[PDB]
Design an enzyme around this catalytic site. Sequence first.
Site, short mmCIF file in Angstrom:
data_model
loop_
_atom_site.label_atom_id
_atom_site.label_comp_id
_atom_site.label_asym_id
_atom_site.label_seq_id
_atom_site.Cartn_x
_atom_site.Cartn_y
_atom_site.Cartn_z
N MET E 74 0.15 35.62 94.57
CA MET E 74 0.75 34.36 94.99
C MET E 74 1.52 34.33 96.45
SD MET E 74 0.40 32.37 92.83
CE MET E 74 -1.26 33.18 92.18
N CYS E 75 1.28 35.67 97.05
CA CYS E 75 1.68 35.92 98.42
C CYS E 75 0.94 35.01 99.44
CB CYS E 75 1.54 37.30 98.87
SG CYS E 75 2.71 38.52 98.23
N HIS E 76 1.82 34.61 100.48
CA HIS E 76 1.05 33.83 101.62
C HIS E 76 0.57 34.61 102.57
CE1 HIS E 76 4.74 31.63 99.93
NE2 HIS E 76 4.40 30.32 100.25
N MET E 114 6.70 42.37 100.52
CA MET E 114 5.40 42.87 99.89
C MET E 114 4.72 43.48 100.77
SD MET E 114 6.39 41.94 96.94
CE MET E 114 4.92 42.99 96.70
N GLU E 115 4.29 42.97 102.25
CA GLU E 115 3.57 43.60 103.24
C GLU E 115 4.13 45.12 103.17
OE1 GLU E 115 4.59 40.47 103.32
OE2 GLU E 115 2.70 39.42 103.30
N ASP E 129 -5.75 60.35 97.82
CA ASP E 129 -7.11 60.43 97.95
C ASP E 129 -7.48 61.63 98.82
OD1 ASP E 129 -9.91 59.26 97.69
OD2 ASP E 129 -9.95 59.06 99.67
#
Lengths: 160, 160, 160, 160, 160, 160
Positions: E74-76, E114-115, E129
């Site tokens: 749901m992130c824009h 969120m970013e 990794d």
Amino acid sequence: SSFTHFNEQGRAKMVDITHKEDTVRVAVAQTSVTVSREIYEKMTSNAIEKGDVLAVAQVAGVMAAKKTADLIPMCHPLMLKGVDIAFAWENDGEAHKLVITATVKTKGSTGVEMEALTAASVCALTVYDMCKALDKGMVIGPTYLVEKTGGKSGHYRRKT
Amino acid sequence: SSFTHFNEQGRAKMVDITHKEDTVRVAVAQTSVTVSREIYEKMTSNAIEKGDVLAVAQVAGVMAAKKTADLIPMCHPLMLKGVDIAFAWENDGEAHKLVITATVKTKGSTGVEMEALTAASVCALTVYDMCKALDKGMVIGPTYLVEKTGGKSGHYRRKT
Amino acid sequence: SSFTHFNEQGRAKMVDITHKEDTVRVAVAQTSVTVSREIYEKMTSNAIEKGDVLAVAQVAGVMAAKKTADLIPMCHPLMLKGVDIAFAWENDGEAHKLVITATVKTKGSTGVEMEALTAASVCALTVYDMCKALDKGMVIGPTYLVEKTGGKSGHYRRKT
Amino acid sequence: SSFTHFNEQGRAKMVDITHKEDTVRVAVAQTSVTVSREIYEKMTSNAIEKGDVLAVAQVAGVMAAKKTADLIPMCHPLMLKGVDIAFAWENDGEAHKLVITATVKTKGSTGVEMEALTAASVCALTVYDMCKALDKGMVIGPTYLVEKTGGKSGHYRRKT
Amino acid sequence: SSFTHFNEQGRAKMVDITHKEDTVRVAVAQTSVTVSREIYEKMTSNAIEKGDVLAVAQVAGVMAAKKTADLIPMCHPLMLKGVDIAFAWENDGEAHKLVITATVKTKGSTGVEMEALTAASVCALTVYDMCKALDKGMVIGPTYLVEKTGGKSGHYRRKT
Amino acid sequence: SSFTHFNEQGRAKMVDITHKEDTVRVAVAQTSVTVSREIYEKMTSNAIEKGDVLAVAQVAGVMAAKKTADLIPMCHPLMLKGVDIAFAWENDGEAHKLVITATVKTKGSTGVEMEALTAASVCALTVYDMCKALDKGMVIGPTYLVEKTGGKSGHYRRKT
């Protein structure tokens, strides 16, 4: 019979196909775009508009087949061995109907029905994008599986 | 009238919208998935299958709206301000028909018809992916634009 | 003079352009694909091969412009307002040279030189992919910026 | 001789490689970035600019190899087994020339020439992005295939 | 108080932010990677291993910030104006702890928490990794928001 | 012992796994999201909020597993055979702790530890995105590998 795409907690999972065997699998999907007479006329004559809408839609469809796993949540990422699309103008009444047929091939433990259906869907959406300047009333579909080979459920073929 | 997505050499281009003004734009698209009685029964009862197919398809549809420019060759990449999807079971005859309606909103110099149409298409494809284990005969569509607001062509609304 | 894409710790960062103003920015990049006589002949005659290589390469180039931020680590994600590509056959000697020119436009606080350069590069790579069955000796480039407008550094234009 | 990437209708298709056998395939591509003396000086001295441009470009190139099928319309999606890039400063005259060599390996029914060429191209574009603040006149390429092994056409190797 | 990411039917939607105003928004997120003494030693000495793990992780983190909308349903999709990451070795006991701090900036109607969180998470995963060949016991996190500015909820700042 | 992800020039490379054999590989990763009492209450009661946060996070996690190679620079692109996620509420003290466990399976020459770790990380980030409207103080992690099977290093299993 039962869903395969849900786990022990009732939520979506990518079904484990580790044990299954690798066989040649093919899937054929079909859809269409019903357009106005004006759109049909400009797409079938090079007198003024020389741009090839089908060439663009074809490319979009092939690329969409490869993006299927990125778009469909539970689809497995596959090494597609082939993707082709065919077009044909028809007349579902007095209106012009562009029929789109996408064929996808691979070698693995899962079918490519979604890749074929997605390729056909995006191909249609691209025809719509390229012609919407002329008319927004275009109709896409119905979209459905024509046939698929390989796998457990054996050979499938929509009755006609 | 003429195509806008082709350049001076008859090849595809992303139309320059630099001069146009930024306004509130909305687009509503609709599609459906016609399914067998068994598929309808398992999707509407939690007695055994507790997995929510619509929740998964909804997520896929919203994410597809954002991927529209990645899939449709000439579409502009936009900062979508909102995306929502609504479901409703109908009976186009004696068969069960899941109707899907996608609404996309934004603020800019170009409409979001493709984002709405793509959201609806992938939402449908996801319902198909989640239920195909039960039946491959499901039919998607027709898919079409219901309405759009903002822009040059003013307000569009499919007649019913 | 100094790098802008490195931070206080000597590692890559996406330069903050929050304070800068939004202006109309354009960038034009150029490249080419030098091919064998056979490849040139089959691309310029529809006698047997009716497939349009340039139509496919054009689509790839436009889509690549939109994927620029996904490929170039520190590039900002932009709302491109326009992308177009032009082709022209030339003869850099006795060999045939397909010249590719990509033009990208936008409205923002950062130039689109990378989008134009990337569009041109992928367009060339696609021509190569479509013709490599005939010859693997094709040469791409040189690739360079032709000009750019808007921004701090004012108008840039490669001297000729 | 004939194109393989076009179908019966003269439009792009992803060639079916289902029947072909899986063998070890390798491809080596080369390109370069010609830069101003100032750019060369800042990239080869840690006196002030400690940022490593090559480390960033290397990462971009490797990631681009994996994105090849997303960028090149008809390329098959492959399970790359290895990707490496090597740099070397040269002097194509009095100007400094950064030579980039990308090597891609895999096991399958199709070569990785496009993956190597794309890796090299994006690696170069990233060097350009990281140094453009200093000068926009940098030139990328020529870009070409150095050699490839495995497959029908046997071993290929550009003559020097 | 109530969820904003669910619609009238109890399913996920991308909240409409059309009416909200555009302001300067910043978000700072933090995480870490706890490693074995051997991993710390090889990452802090150039005696033998000259590869820069942090340079690679930094690039991955910045690119992840841009992919946030592709990963979080749901992130824009936003036009990020800046992304930077900072590293610092600490000792949460006798074990070595690499602290990662990601800062994201933008101008719009929605925050970039969120970013920043995604940038930090992928940066950490990349360190893992690059060092897993030495030890698989590395621990990532905790990951959390340090602060955010702009928007309705005003200035947020985790208490310490 | 030594790094495998760096080349002869001290820069990142995707390790060549061409010679290795294909075996069944599985990886299990774990993380968590510590939330406020209010968030726990709204996620565990359907009295008012009927939206299923876990269903959305589950989908995001599965899709993230497939995007692992797009996010982690040196990871190989794999044909995942299965991906599943499990949730469990715990009480790491008096605070509510949502434990997330991701299991990834495949058949190949390289492990899927990164796919499992990435799936878990994005699943957690999605829970955070869906509940942040209620509280920004949520904490993600620690995130770590629980176990992995197949490959050179044999069976790994975190001691508890």
